[PDB]
Amino acid sequence: IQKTPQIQVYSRHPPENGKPNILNCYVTQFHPPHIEIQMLKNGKKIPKVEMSDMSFSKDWSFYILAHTEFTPTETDTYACRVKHASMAEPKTVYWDRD
Amino acid sequence: RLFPLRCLQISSFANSSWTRTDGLAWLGELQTHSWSNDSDTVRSLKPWSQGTFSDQQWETLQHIFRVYRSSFTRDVKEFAKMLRLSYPLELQVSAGCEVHNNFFHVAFQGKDILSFQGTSWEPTQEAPLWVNLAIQVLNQDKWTRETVQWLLNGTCPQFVSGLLESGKSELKKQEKPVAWLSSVPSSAHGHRQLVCHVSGFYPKPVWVMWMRGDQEQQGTHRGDFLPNADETWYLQATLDVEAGEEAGLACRVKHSSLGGQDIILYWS
Ligand SMILES: CCCCCCCC/C=C/CCCCCCCCCCCCCC(=O)N[C@@H](CO[C@@H]1O[C@H](CO)[C@H](O)[C@H](OS(=O)(=O)O)[C@H]1O)[C@H](O)/C=C/CCCCCCCCCCCCC
Ligand SMILES: *[C@@H]1O[C@H](CO)[C@@H](O)[C@H](O)[C@H]1NC(C)=O
Numbered sequence: 001i002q003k004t005p006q007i008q009v010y011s012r013h014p015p016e017n018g019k020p021n022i023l024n025c026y027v028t029q030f031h032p033p034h035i036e037i038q039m040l041k042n043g044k045k046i047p048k049v050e051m052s053d054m055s056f057s058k059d060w061s062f063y064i065l066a067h068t069e070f071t072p073t074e075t076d077t078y079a080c081r082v083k084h085a086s087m088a089e090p091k092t093v094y095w096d097r098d
Numbered sequence: 099r100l101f102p103l104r105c106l107q108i109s110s111f112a113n114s115s116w117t118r119t120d121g122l123a124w125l126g127e128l129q130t131h132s133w134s135n136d137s138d139t140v141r142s143l144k145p146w147s148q149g150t151f152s153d154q155q156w157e158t159l160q161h162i163f164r165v166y167r168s169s170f171t172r173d174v175k176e177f178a179k180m181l182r183l184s185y186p187l188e189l190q191v192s193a194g195c196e197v198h199n200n201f202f203h204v205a206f207q208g209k210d211i212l213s214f215q216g217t218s219w220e221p222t223q224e225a226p227l228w229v230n231l232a233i234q235v236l237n238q239d240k241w242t243r244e245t246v247q248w249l250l251n252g253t254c255p256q257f258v259s260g261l262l263e264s265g266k267s268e269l270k271k272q273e274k275p276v277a278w279l280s281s282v283p284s285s286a287h288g289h290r291q292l293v294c295h296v297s298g299f300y301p302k303p304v305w306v307m308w309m310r311g312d313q314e315q316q317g318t319h320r321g322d323f324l325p326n327a328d329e330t331w332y333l334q335a336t337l338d339v340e341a342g343e344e345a346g347l348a349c350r351v352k353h354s355s356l357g358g359q360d361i362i363l364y365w366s
Contacts, residue, residue: 001207001208003208008322008324010295010324010332010334011297012297012326012327012328013297013298014276014278014295022326024324024325024326024327026324031188032110032186032188033108033110033188034110050327052129052325052327053120053122053132053134054108055106055122055124055129056106056108056192060190060208061208062108065325065327067326067327096280097280098280098281
């Protein structure tokens, strides 16, 4: 059967405006392994995105890490969008900072 | 401190024309090898990925895997036409060993179907009837059953032993965590959710708990261990608190890399 991907967005370092940081997008619990992942700045697709090799847990569900360099500001927004066959519409999760 | 070697294979078949096979190897929590479908070579990710194995011992395994990948793809397409199984096909393979037992597990459509036990393939306890027909064909292949038995009991244990010694410096490494606080609005009115982020720590074990004085807050919710790109871990512990009862709250972090020195972060 198909499994819905869970999405988690988090930064590598303490978020500070004007300071370069790393944004992570961790997608888990999905099947089939065919999946499309995009990280967004202000709604636009970030070109410089690297992804680790896709792997699977003990239970045969897949997981994969996406990350990119980003400099957070007051007005900028960041999100990770995922397209999978288990969902009719793409799922978007925003980066929550304060 | 156990460091098992997990050899993972992800083979997908959309149609009779399209197919991919990607692989990788885990030693504990560190990825040691990367096997891209587009490459004829299993790529090493670390200076000690070969271990004790010489370059000549390594190329032997290199050609074996190259043959296996082409042969695996052929056999699955053959088993599809034979067992009357419809595309798409999803196969996953989990093999390897740990030096002090070995294992070979394959999965069809996210479910276990068979494993390699002793000297032959056996179907799983929960497995469809057509699996038994596939086992009968697989078990007729005497050369494959001897090669797998030779890799799991002969090649693998000597290889893992070579990895643990050649990479003991990186496997036993200690990275110090860095913590910070934040607060998102809670679902209930008059409540707020405090978040204590902990990132950059290694190895995996870590202790995070919200505190008042010396009293541990049992309302603390520990999250999952999320990976970073630099082979370090991320973790956050949340706590729902009422408005006006946020004062006196602190997040305490304990890790082996700190050497008995706690990380304390009082709120506001
Ligand atoms: C630890 C060292 C490595 C560390 C670094 C790892 C690098 C990272 C990579 C990770 C990926 C690891 C995942 C893969 C596991 C490792 C490989 C282990 C298996 C090696 C198998 C070697 C043997 C092999 O390739 N056999 C292949 C060639 O066999 C030979 O073919 C010949 C014709 O070309 C002849 O027929 C011959 O028989 S004869 O009698 O007629 O002469 C026969 O023995 C054979 O095709 C392979 C079979 C593998 C089957 C495994 C699948 C298990 C059951 C799954 C069935 C699914 C069917 C479902 C269909 C919907
Ligand atoms: C994956 O590699 C195999 C090996 O030749 C190749 O046949 C296949 O076309 C590759 N898959 C894709 C999608 O290019």
